[PDB]
RNA sequence: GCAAGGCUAAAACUCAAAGGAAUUGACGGGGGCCCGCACAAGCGGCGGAGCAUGUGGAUUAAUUCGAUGCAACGCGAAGAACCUUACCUGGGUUUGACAUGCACAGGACGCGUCUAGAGAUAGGCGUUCCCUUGUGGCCUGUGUGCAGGUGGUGCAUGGCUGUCGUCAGCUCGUGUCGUGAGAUGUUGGGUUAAGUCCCGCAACGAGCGCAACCCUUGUCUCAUGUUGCCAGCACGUAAUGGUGGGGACUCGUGAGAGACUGCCGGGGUCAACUCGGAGGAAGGUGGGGAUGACGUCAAGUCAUCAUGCCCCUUAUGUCCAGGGCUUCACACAUGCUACAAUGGCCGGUACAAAGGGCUGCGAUGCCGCGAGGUUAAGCGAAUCCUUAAAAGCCGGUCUCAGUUCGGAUCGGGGUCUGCAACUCGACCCCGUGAAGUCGGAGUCGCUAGUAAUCGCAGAUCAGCAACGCUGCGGUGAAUACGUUCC
């Protein structure tokens, strides 16, 4: 509800999004394995590394 | 509206008795979007229709249309301190509309048990100008012959 | 509101049953998500606000 | 009241968010942490005219970017303040903080900063269409301005009854998704209530 | 003067005005033009029944407070058994549940027991880290300022919101005209959804609005191949794309192409633009969303928060247990389920979309008529679960009855959540089977994937009074002469 009192009918919509990419497959190699974690990702990027 | 005429919907052949005016009256009985349903009962009765004179159905069909379409409506219009109505000539594809509602309208309200057997009794009396809907027929026309006098006022 | 009653929801209840969410900007006891831990109100001016991420205005 | 916020609706667009993480499972409790910085900062700074505050955070280290008209006040003596509320931002979150403070360019062409300072004159007793015309004056001083608006409502010199007055010069096309708009709102703690000052700035279209 | 009455003509007293012309607006049962589900033309309702929910009034120890023509009334409340809670009765407390600053005195705290409805009070115990070695932290004591207040004023206010109205308007700079308020621009001719644009003119410009920029849906191209897809290979057991694998098709989602009156014909000052084509997934704003100019209503909110005054401080602060917010001669409002055969019931079978999941989603198995219980696989998920969509289709039966319609109310028996289901939760089983047979004066929504009807999901949430609200897809109409009237 848009007002802080009894104006049921004026209403936001708010969303939250949520981007998911890049599923690959890599060779675990040693000497990659040490490289693929040296690299500062940005604030707004999550990884797993499952 | 304001901004004059709208364009008026295209009803396709329908396909098991090859004739639009088969399909404008499902859509008439149809009720609450049941349309497969709608077309069990206006395909039932005029399957009932045949069983009952031999004759082609939609034959039959168009015989009850004729005795049904009203040539003269009665439209209201006030002038002064009084009222009255214009007898108006009804464009042709109002009285297929005015027609079909007055089959469809008067067998739901009619002294049978289901709708099938209800709507194939008013059509088949209609196309021998018995039923109820012939008699809104003529109840229209000596309503609207029986003011002339007023028929100078046409908008 | 009451900031006895914001301290109170903050701790252990008896009953565990008997606790309940307030809103984490201004105490309310209604309208509180539990996705932001904010009522409808403080949601929304922080929404506006970009002061938390992903969310933003809805067309469809 | 009838116009939305500016901000959040380029939000995506124009303008970009303040605070920059990730939180699947501990939003909420980023959140609370997020509006407990933020209180910090707005009292007990506010001489040096915090522009704005951006929190971002990874993984046990959030690092806070507030920016300022004034760099060398809040650090004072060589970081007797500084890292005071350093001290203070860390026996709140209970983590190590990355700190800058900034700078601003041009605070007479960045709302909040001009917005701030109208109700610091107005909290003077100062004559308020005199407090609008400086800041709208020394606005369109400033290079990449095409537009500016400032509206101030409240009991406005004391009086009974309260009004509106607003002045402008330039073009503010609030309609305009592609427009750069900046936008501040403060409020002026007079002794007559409350005075909410606004500002509109224009700064072209987009880069 | 026959009369009606004419002529001449004061004052007491009372008011601070009474007037004249012009100006901007508002209004008219004035005029011109124009629009809008405004009417008409249609389709389905509401007002009658029963229940759900809010409100008026009444009641009560209290039924906390706010909202009150449109623009209050399934509104604040996106969840009142305790909590929430602001109210009532009663029991406690009083630098206090919370914050710091100053003055004298040294562990806070924790677990466990007893008392009490609980709050708390006590028997116990574990105990001073820090150099309470001076110096730190902390503690209550003891005060002091103070803290605290959902106490008042929305007619002191900020903020935020409704609203006229998503109506097409509202103004300014310079010039000119008028003693002046003001006018002109913004009028006139067309045209537009539009102060949209063109042509004229003592006006020339400019700004805020309109349109556009953004999201969503409608077609295509390139990139892309898992957890998604399966054309052609091989396995297909169990037919569970299950497997090797494939980049074809969809799909997912990045980047782009596309619609502009661009092209043709007629009309128009050759102009704006309009009527009709061609090609295209789409044609003149393609559909819908986001977006509320200057202001109006002393509109709403001091109970989101903030705040100026004002009031309370052994209480109008604050803790707790029970109760209330759910009462009931009535009245209104918004909905739901109905009054059946275009239907009910039973058996069989088909086709979705958008969402949720770790204090979780519970497949499978097993027990129960059933709600459920139990065991436990897989899954922070295009992977697993939610998840069987319901209408529909086909077959059978009922045979127009207050009934095999309706499912209120009441009797009995249960399950689950929770410390706790009496006041006052939902669900399940068996029994019971009320009113209601289409609703008076009146009144509402809707112009197309709309109305009508059918399910599914989410938020808040332990559970829920969820028939609400915000969304999602399924099936899918009837009409519009027209502008006289409201
Ligand atoms: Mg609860
Ligand atoms: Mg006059
Ligand atoms: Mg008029
Ligand atoms: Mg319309
Ligand atoms: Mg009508
Ligand atoms: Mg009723
Ligand atoms: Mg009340
Ligand atoms: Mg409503
Ligand atoms: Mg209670
Ligand atoms: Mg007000
Ligand atoms: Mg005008
Ligand atoms: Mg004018
Ligand atoms: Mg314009
Ligand atoms: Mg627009
Ligand atoms: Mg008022
Ligand atoms: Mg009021
Ligand atoms: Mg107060
Ligand atoms: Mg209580
Ligand atoms: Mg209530
Ligand atoms: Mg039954
Ligand atoms: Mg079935
Ligand atoms: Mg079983
Ligand atoms: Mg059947
Ligand atoms: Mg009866
Ligand atoms: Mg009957
Ligand atoms: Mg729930
Ligand atoms: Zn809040």
């Known amino acids: 509800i848009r007002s802080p009192h009894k104006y049921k009918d004026s209403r936001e919509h708010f969303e939250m999004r949520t981007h998911k990419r890049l599923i690959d497959i890599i060779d675990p190699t040693p000497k990659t394995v040490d490289a693929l974690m040296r690299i ?9 590394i499952q | 509206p304001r901004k004059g005429p709208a364009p008026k919907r295209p009803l396709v052949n329908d396909p098991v008795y090859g004739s639009q005016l088969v399909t404008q009256l ?32 939609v034959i039959t069909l168009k015989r009850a249309l004729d005795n049904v379409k009203p040539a003269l409506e009665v439209r209201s219009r006030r002038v002064g301190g009084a009222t009255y109505q214009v007898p108006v000539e009804v464009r042709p594809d109002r009285s297929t509309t005015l027609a079909l509602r007055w089959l469809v309208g008067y067998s739901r309200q009619r002294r049978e048990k289901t709708m099938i057997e209800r ?37 | 509101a009451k900031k006895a009653l914001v301290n109170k929801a903050a701790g ?6 008997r606790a309940y969410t307030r809103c984490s900007k201004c105490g309310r006891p209604r309208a509180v998500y ?26 469809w | 009241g009838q116009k939305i916020n500016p901000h959040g609706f380029r939000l995506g667009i124009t303008t970009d968010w303040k605070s920059r993480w990730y939180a699947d499972k501990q939003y909420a409790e980023y959140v609370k942490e997020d509006v407990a ?15 704005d505050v951006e929190i971002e955070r990874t993984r046990d280290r959030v690092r806070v970017d507030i920016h300022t008209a004034r760099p060398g006040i809040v650090i004072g003596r060589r970081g007797t303040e500084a890292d005071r509320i350093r001290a203070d931002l860390e026996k709140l979150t209970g983590k190590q903080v990355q700190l800058n403070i900034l700078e601003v360019k041009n605070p007479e062409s960045q709302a909040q900063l001009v917005a701030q300072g109208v109700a610091e004159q107005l909290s003077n007793r100062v004559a308020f269409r005199r407090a609008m015309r400086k800041a ?58 409350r005075i909410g000052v606004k500002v509109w700035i224009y700064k072209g279209d987009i880069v």
């Not at chain 1, 500062?40 to 797993?48: E, F, G, H, I, T």
């Not at chain 2, 709507?119 to 009396?125: F, G, P, Q, T, V």
């Not at chain 2, 021998?128 to 109840?139: F, I, M, W, Y």
């Not at chain 4, 400032?150 to 010069?169: D, H, I, K, N, T």
């Open chain 1, 40 to 48: 500062d990702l940005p604030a707004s990027v999550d990884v797993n």
């Open chain 2, 26 to 57: 499902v859509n008439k009985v149809l009720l609450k979007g049941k349309k497969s349903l709608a077309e069990r009962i206006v395909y039932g009765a005029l399957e009932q229709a045949r069983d009952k004179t031999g004759t082609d159905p």
């Open chain 2, 119 to 155: 709507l194939a009794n008013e059509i088949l009396d209609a196309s021998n100008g018995l039923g109820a809907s012939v008699k809104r027929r003529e109840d229209t026309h000596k309503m609207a012959e029986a003011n002339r006098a007023f028929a100078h006022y046409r908008w």
């Open chain 3, 12 to 17: 252990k209840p008896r009953f565990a049953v």
């Open chain 3, 34 to 59: 539990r996705k932001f831990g904010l009522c409808r109100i403080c949601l929304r001016e922080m929404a506006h606000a970009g002061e938390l991420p992903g969310v933003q205005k809805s067309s």
């Open chain 4, 37 to 51: 910085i933020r209180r910090l900062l707005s009292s007990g700074l506010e001489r040096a005219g915090i522009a």
């Open chain 4, 136 to 193: 709208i004056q020394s606005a369109m001083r400033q290079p990449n301005v095409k537009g500016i608006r400032v509206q101030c409502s409240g009991r406005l010199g004391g009086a009974e009854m309260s009004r509106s007055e607003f002045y402008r010069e330039g073009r503010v096309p609030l309609h305009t998704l592609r427009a750069d708009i900046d936008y501040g709102l403060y409020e002026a703690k007079t002794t007559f209530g």
